[PDB]
Design an enzyme around this catalytic site. Structure first.
Site, PDB file in Angstrom:
ATOM      1  CD  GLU A 175      -3.061  -1.164   0.049  1.00 55.93           C
ATOM      2  OE1 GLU A 175      -2.833  -0.356  -0.916  1.00 55.93           O
ATOM      3  OE2 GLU A 175      -4.080  -1.887   0.224  1.00 55.93           O
TER       4      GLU A 175
HETATM    5  N1  LIG Z   1      -2.816  -9.780  -0.026  1.00 58.62           N
HETATM    6  C1  LIG Z   1      -2.811  -8.585  -0.584  1.00 58.62           C
HETATM    7  N2  LIG Z   1      -1.886  -7.929  -1.162  1.00 58.62           N
HETATM    8  C2  LIG Z   1      -1.931  -6.651  -1.466  1.00 58.62           C
HETATM    9  N3  LIG Z   1      -2.976  -5.904  -1.582  1.00 58.62           N
HETATM   10  C3  LIG Z   1      -4.023  -6.340  -0.561  1.00 58.62           C
HETATM   11  N4  LIG Z   1      -5.193  -5.879  -0.492  1.00 58.62           N
HETATM   12  C4  LIG Z   1      -5.693  -6.788   0.180  1.00 58.62           C
HETATM   13  N5  LIG Z   1      -5.122  -7.833   0.267  1.00 58.62           N
HETATM   14  C5  LIG Z   1      -3.818  -7.846  -0.322  1.00 58.62           C
END
Ligand SMILES: Nc1ncnc2[nH]cnc12
Length: 261
Positions: A175
């Site tokens: 993120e």
């Molecule tokens: N496993 C994951 N990897 C990256 N973004 C995500 N958003 C939700 N789950 C995730």
């Protein structure tokens, strides 16, 4: 496939900034962009994956495997009992699972399966962590360091422990790469634990929609308003690319042309 290392155990703001720079520069398509923001590639560009090796203060490591096209964490590996242990989410297809196995643990003669026995959605991870919102799971450098030590080289551990680690690592790696705003939340809080605020969560949940809105914008004007959250949980009604672009690290892949600068 490249492996980028982040030393969690000896981390600094500058070293984290460099990590984010390196991960974005590896993951991005070499040319695709909209409004100057680099975009992730189609699912066919090789290498299709990026590995991220997280090192704790005792030099234990965990390696995450990320899909380049959407930056999802697909699984992770650790060293245990002399073998490479690969832990894959249960929503990865057989074809991709074979890739994960062989990319995280190429030595087929010294490896071990230890599945992640749940899917990779935030709703699921939150359920496993016992929380109604991942606002309730603190992020931070010392937390990430501590969590590595609860898992790496550890025979058995609870799904709660694992899900907590995954929530922290997903947000501090994927993120934060996706969103300069989230990188900057980590940097502003580098010396302490923190709870992801409503704007962090909103950006996380709307990344795909944001990419499409930016890709579709004409002369910087979004075709329709995009409603997000400010950090005080008030509505943020985005109307122009100018307002959202500073928060963006990477656009999700969107097919077709766009306004490139
Ligand atoms: N496993 C994951 N990897 C990256 N973004 C995500 N958003 C939700 N789950 C995730």
């Amino acid at each position: 496939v490249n492996t980028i290392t982040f030393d969690v155990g000896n981390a600094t703001i500058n070293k984290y900034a460099t990590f984010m720079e390196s991960l974005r520069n590896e993951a991005k398509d070499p040319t695709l962009k909209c409004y100057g923001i680099p975009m992730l590639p189609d699912s066919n560009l090789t290498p299709k994956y990026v590995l991220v090796k997280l090192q704790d203060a005792s030099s234990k490591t965990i390696t995450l495997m990320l899909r380049r096209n959407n930056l999802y964490v697909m699984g992770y590996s650790d060293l245990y009992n002399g073998k490479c242990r690969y832990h894959i989410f249960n929503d990865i297809s057989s074809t991709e699972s074979t890739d994960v196995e062989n990319t995280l643990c190429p030595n087929s003669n010294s490896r071990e399966k230890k599945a992640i026995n749940y899917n990779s959605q935030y709703s699921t991870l939150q359920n496993k962590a016992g929380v109604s919102s991942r606002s309730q799971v603190q992020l931070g450098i010392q937390i990430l360091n501590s969590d590595i030590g609860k898992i790496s080289g550890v025979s058995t551990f609870t799904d709660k422990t694992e899900a907590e680690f995954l929530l922290v690592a997903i947000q501090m790696v994927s993120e934060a790469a996706r969103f300069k705003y989230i990188e900057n939340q980590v940097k502003t809080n580098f010396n302490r634990a923190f709870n992801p605020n409503p704007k962090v969560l909103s950006l996380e949940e709307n990344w795909g929609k944001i990419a499409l809105a930016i890709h579709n914008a004409k002369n910087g004007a979004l075709t329709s308003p995009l409603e997000l959250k400010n950090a005080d949980d008030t509505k943020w009604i985005v109307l122009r690319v100018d307002e959202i672009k500073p928060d963006m690290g990477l656009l999700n892949y969107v097919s077709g042309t766009c306004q490139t600068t």
